Amino acid sequence: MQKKEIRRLRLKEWFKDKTLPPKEKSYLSQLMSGRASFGEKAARRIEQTYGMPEGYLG
Amino acid sequence: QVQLVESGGGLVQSGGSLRLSCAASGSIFRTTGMNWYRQTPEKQREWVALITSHGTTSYAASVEGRFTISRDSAGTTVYLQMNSLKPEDAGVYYCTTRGYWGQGTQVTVSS
């Protein structure tokens, strides 16, 4: 797949065994689907927000 | 680089309550989310709950409404409050953040 989509696949994989927080479920879904964008600064932000390993998303 | 310490486990009667704590090096929980997992006699590593650096939370269906995840006032410690415990909540509970994992703490429910 394209590199833009692998990043979205990584996010979906992080939450596969999880429930999404009611307050975050709309933004999370937008990121997974692509209706919101997903830059480098954002990727580090999300990784810190949920405690993902550094660089988990790319 | 990051160390994590779970505590608060022990023996508890069915229907009782308990509060687990997770300590994390470098005051990291002030600015970073985390997850709790548990390992029960049948099946392994089952996600339990999460709290983000924002303070927002989610729970597994099997504990939602009975477990509550929060930070202490300092923001350095995360609590997994449990109430209305059942024998099927027994297991080893692990805290995790940034890919690092605690040693775990055992919850035994009598009954």
HEC states along A2-27?
A: CHHHHHHHHHHHHHCCCCCCCCCHHH
Q: Classify domain B4-109 at the CATH topology level.
A: Immunoglobulin-like (2.60.40)
B55, closest residue in chain A (CA to CA):
A49
Interface residue A51 vs chain B (CB under 8 A)? yes
| Distances, alpha carbon B77 to alpha carbons B28, B50, B56, in Å | 9, 13, 15
**Resolution, angstroms, 1 dp:** 1.6
In a domain, A44, yes or no: yes
Alpha-carbon distance B26 to B45, whole Å?
A: 26
How many degrees, rounded to 5, is the angle at CA B49 between CA B45 and CA B21?
A: 95
- Looking at the partner chain, which of A50, A54, A56 has a beta carbon nearest the beta carbon of B52? A50
- CA diameter of chain A: 30
Backbone angles phi, psi at B82, to 5 degrees: -125, 140
Backbone angles phi, psi at B11, to 5 degrees: -85, 140
**H-helix or E-strand spanning residue A45:** helix A40-50
B45, closest residue in chain A (CA to CA):
A17
Q: Which amino acid is at B38?
A: R
In a domain, A57, yes or no: no
In a domain, A24, yes or no: yes
Interface residue A17 vs chain B (CB under 8 A)? yes
Q: What are the E-state strand segments in B8-104?
A: 10-12, 18-24, 34-39, 46-51, 57-59, 67-71, 77-82, 91-97, 100-101
Residue B90 near residue B109 (C-beta atoms within 8 A): yes
Alpha-carbon distance B47 to B44, whole Å?
A: 10
In a domain, A23, yes or no: yes
Q: Which phi-psi region, left, alpha or beta, contains residue B104 (left: φ > 0; alpha: ψ -120 to 50)? A: left
Question: Of how many residues is chain A composed?
Answer: 58
Q: CB–CB of B58 and A50 under 8 A?
A: no
Query: Looking at CA atoms only, how far is residue A3 from chain B in angstroms?
Result: 23
Query: Looking at CA atoms only, how far is residue A45 from chain B in angstroms?
Result: 10
Q: Which phi-psi region, left, alpha or beta, contains residue B77 (left: φ > 0; alpha: ψ -120 to 50)? A: beta
For residue A12, what are the contacts with CB-CB under 8 A and spacing of at least 6? A32
- Which structural domain range is residue A40 located in? 3-50
In a domain, A13, yes or no: yes
Q: CB–CB of B52 and A49 under 8 A?
A: yes
Q: Which residue, among B69, B73, B108, has the nearest Cα to B91 in the 3D structure?
A: B108
Number of domains making up chain A: 1
Helix axes A3-15, A40-50, angle to 10 degrees: 10
Q: Which residue, among B14, B45, B37, has the nearest Cα to B108 in the 3D structure?
A: B14
Alpha-carbon distance B98 to B35, whole Å?
A: 10
A44, closest residue in chain B (CA to CA):
B32
